[PDB]
Amino acid sequence: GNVDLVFLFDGSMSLQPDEFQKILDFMKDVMKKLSNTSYQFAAVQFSTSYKTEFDFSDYVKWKDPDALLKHVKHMLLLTNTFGAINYVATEVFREELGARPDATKVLIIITDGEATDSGNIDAAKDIIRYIIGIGKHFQTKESQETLHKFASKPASEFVKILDTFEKLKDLFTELQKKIYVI
Numbered sequence: 203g204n205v206d207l208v209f210l211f212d213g214s215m216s217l218q219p220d221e222f223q224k225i226l227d228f229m230k231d232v233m234k235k236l237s238n239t240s241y242q243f244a245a246v247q248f249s250t251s252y253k254t255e256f257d258f259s260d261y262v263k264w265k266d267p268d269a270l271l272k273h274v275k276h277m278l279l280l281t282n283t284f285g286a287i288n289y290v291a292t293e294v295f296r297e298e299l300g301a302r303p304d305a306t307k308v309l310i311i312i313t314d315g316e317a318t319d320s321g322n323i324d325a326a327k328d329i330i331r332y333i334i335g336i337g338k339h340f341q342t343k344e345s346q347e348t349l350h351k352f353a354s355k356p357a358s359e360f361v362k363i364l365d366t367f368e369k370l371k372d373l374f375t376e377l378q379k380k381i382y383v384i
C-alpha cells in the first residue's frame with residue numbers, strides 16, 4: 203500500500219509573504235507527521251507556470267521537509283490551475299522522477315483564488331484529489347463551487363474552504379485525527 207502524494211501549491215501575486223509561508227508550513231507539517239511511512243512526496247508550485255520544487259526521488263534522498271522547501275521562490279503571478287493539475291499528472295507522477303508504479307496517487311491542491319485558465323483535468327482523474335481554498339477570494343458560495351471540478355467526489359469530502367490562512371493549523375489538527383495504523 204504505497205502512497206505517492208503531491209502538494210500542488212498556489213504561488214500567485216495575491217499571496218502575502220506570511221500567507222505563502224503558512225501554505226509551506228502546512229505542507230511541512232503533513233510530511234513530518236508521515237515521515238518513515240509508505241508515503242513519499244513531491245511538491246509543485248503553480249502560478250502562471252509550474253515548478254517541481256522537489257520530486258519523489260528528492261524526498262527519498264533527503265527525507266527532510268525543511269531542507270526540501272528551503273529554496274522555494276514565490277512566483278507572484280496568476281493562477282493557472284487547470285494547466286497545473288495537468289502538469290502534475292503528466293510531468294510529476296513519473297517513474298523517472300521516483301514515482302512508484304501502482305502506488306495510490308494523491309494530490310493536495312492549495313489555492314487562494316479562482317483559476318485564471320480553463321479546459322479539463324481528465325489526465326489527472328485517477329488521482330485522489332483534495333483542494334484547499336483559502337481566504338477572501340472564496341467568500342461567496344459561487345466561488346467555492348468553482349473548486350469542485352478539480353477535486354474528487356463528493357465535494358463535501360474533498361473540498362476544504364478555509365476563511366483564513368491561520369485555519370491551516372486547525373485543518374492539520376483535524377487531518378491528524380484520521381491517522382491510523384492499519
Ligand SMILES: CNC(=O)c1ccc(-n2nc(-c3ccc(C(=O)NCCCN)cc3)c3ccccc32)cc1
Pocket residue numbers: 205306308310330332334362373376377380
Ligand atoms: C490515500 N489517502 C490519503 O493518503 C489521504 C487521505 C486524506 C487526506 N486528507 N484528509 C483531510 C481531512 C479529513 C477529515 C477532516 C475532518 O474530519 N474535519 C472535521 C471538521 C469538524 N469541525 C479534515 C481533514 C485533508 C485535508 C486536506 C488535504 C488532505 C486531507 C490526505 C491524504
Ligand SMILES: [Mg+2]
Pocket residue numbers: 212214215216217281314315
Ligand atoms: Mg491568488
